[PDB]
Every structure is written in C-alpha cells, then in structure tokens.
Amino acid sequence: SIRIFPRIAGRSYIIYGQTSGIICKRMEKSDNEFVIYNYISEHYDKFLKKYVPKLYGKNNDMLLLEDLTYNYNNPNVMDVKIGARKRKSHTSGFFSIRGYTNSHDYKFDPDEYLTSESTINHIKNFMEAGGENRDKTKQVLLKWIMKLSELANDLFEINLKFDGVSLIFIYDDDCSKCDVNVVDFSRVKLIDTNDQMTISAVTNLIKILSELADNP
Numbered sequence: 001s002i003r004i005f006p007r008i009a010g011r012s013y014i015i016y017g018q019t020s021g022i023i024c025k026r027m028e029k030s031d032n033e034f035v036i037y038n039y040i041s042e043h044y045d046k047f048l049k050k051y052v053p054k055l056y057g058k059n060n061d062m063l064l065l066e067d068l069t070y071n072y073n074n075p076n077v078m079d080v081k082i083g084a085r086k087r088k089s090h091t092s093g094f095f096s097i098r099g100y101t102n103s104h105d106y107k108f109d110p111d112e113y114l115t116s117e118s119t120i121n122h123i124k125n126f127m128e129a130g131g132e133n134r135d136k137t138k139q140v141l142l143k144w145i146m147k148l149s150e151l152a153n154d155l156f157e158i159n160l161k162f163d164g165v166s167l168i169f170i171y172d173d174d175c176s177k178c179d180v181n182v183v184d185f186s187r188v189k190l191i192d193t194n195d196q197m198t199i200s201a202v203t204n205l206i207k208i209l210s211e212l213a214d215n216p
Ligand SMILES: O=P(O)(O)O[C@H]1[C@H](OP(=O)(O)O)[C@@H](OP(=O)(O)O)[C@H](O)[C@@H](O)[C@@H]1OP(=O)(O)O
Pocket: 011, 028, 029, 081, 084, 085, 086, 087, 088, 163, 164, 165, 186, 187
C-alpha cells in the first residue's frame, strides 16, 4: 500500500503520501534540506510562498511536500538543474536538463553534453505533448517566462548558494494549466552575496523560452 512516486529525475526515495496532494521525500544523506526549508521560511518567507512547494511537515526522515502534479489530469514534467553540480560542468552550459515526461521516446540521456541546438530541441520535445495549438503552447511559455523573470529579479536579494537546486516545469496536455517551482535544497549554503551562477541559469532559460514564444 506504498505507491512509488513517478519521479522524472533524482535518486531520492519519493512515495505518495497516505493522503491526497502530498508526496514523501526521504532525506537520504542529511536533514540539511529541512534545515534550509526552515531558514528560508524565517528569512525569505515571500520567496518560499511564490517559488517553492509547501512543506507541510516532517515524519522521521520524510518531508511531506505539496505534490506539484496533484491538480493536473495529464501533467508533463521537466527537471532542469539550475544550481551548481558537485564537480561536473552543466550539460547545457548554464543549466542541465535532468529529465522529462516521455524523454526515452527522444533518446534523452542525462550524461550527454549538448550544443545550443540540442538543448533547444529537448525543450521543444518536452513541449510536443502540448499538441498543435500554437496560441495555447505560447501561453504556457509566457506564463513560465512571467514567473522565471520575477524569480531571477528576486534572486538578486537572496544570499544563498543554490547548489543542486532544480526548476520543475509542469504543464497539462490540454495547455490549460502550467507552473514552475524550485526544489531540492539538500546542498543549499549560506553566503555573503547573491548566486550569480544560478541567476545566469534562469536568465538563459528565459532567453530560450522567449525565442520559442516568439518563433514564427
Ligand atoms: O551534482 P550532480 O549534478 O553531479 O548530481 C549528482 C547528485 O547531486 P545533486 O543532486 O546534489 O547536485 C547526486 O545527489 P546527492 O548526493 O546530493 O543525492 C546524485 O545521487 C548523483 O547521481 C548525481 O550525479 P550525476 O547525475 O552527475 O551522475
């Protein structure tokens, strides 16, 4: 009666909660992810409310988090790592696509270093389940750009190093609903300045999505 959550990337044990709208993520290595949710909650509460799934509680080593997929009939999900990797450089220069819904169909490989063209093509791949209605897909891109724009603006005033953090892009097959949020705070660190490397990941994504929203 344990139901494994269909992650798109990561190595962490994630299960469905025993009740609706909750997933349980195991803190495998340390409780640093909980320490960081609590720090952001006390120092950057606005950031937490706008950009981050709700943390409802802790049970031993499990975080009870808002299921970002819960309100969707046919969610498509993409995990894009915008914070630094442990040692390796990013597969797309400023960020790494770690996975998306149906990526096996397009021979996506998270180990593969990509050109600009292949990066753009993988984001186009992720958008294909959104069907042939250009106005509807454009509105999904424009809503993502609206929220990433405000995130990149707000990041200038946040003194955290967002190591390992991902953007979770979600849209419904019908293109009636979409969202992007920040997840995975296990390696976030306190620092004296803002994280310019993470801000460049977001502004590069805003550039790519803008080209897609505008193409003829
Ligand atoms: O740092 P990166 O991008 O190398 O990602 C590495 C992850 O670190 P983070 O998710 O914190 O960045 C590791 O997670 P944690 O020990 O933190 O669970 C994960 O287990 C590795 O498989 C992954 O290596 P890769 O995907 O490159 O084979």
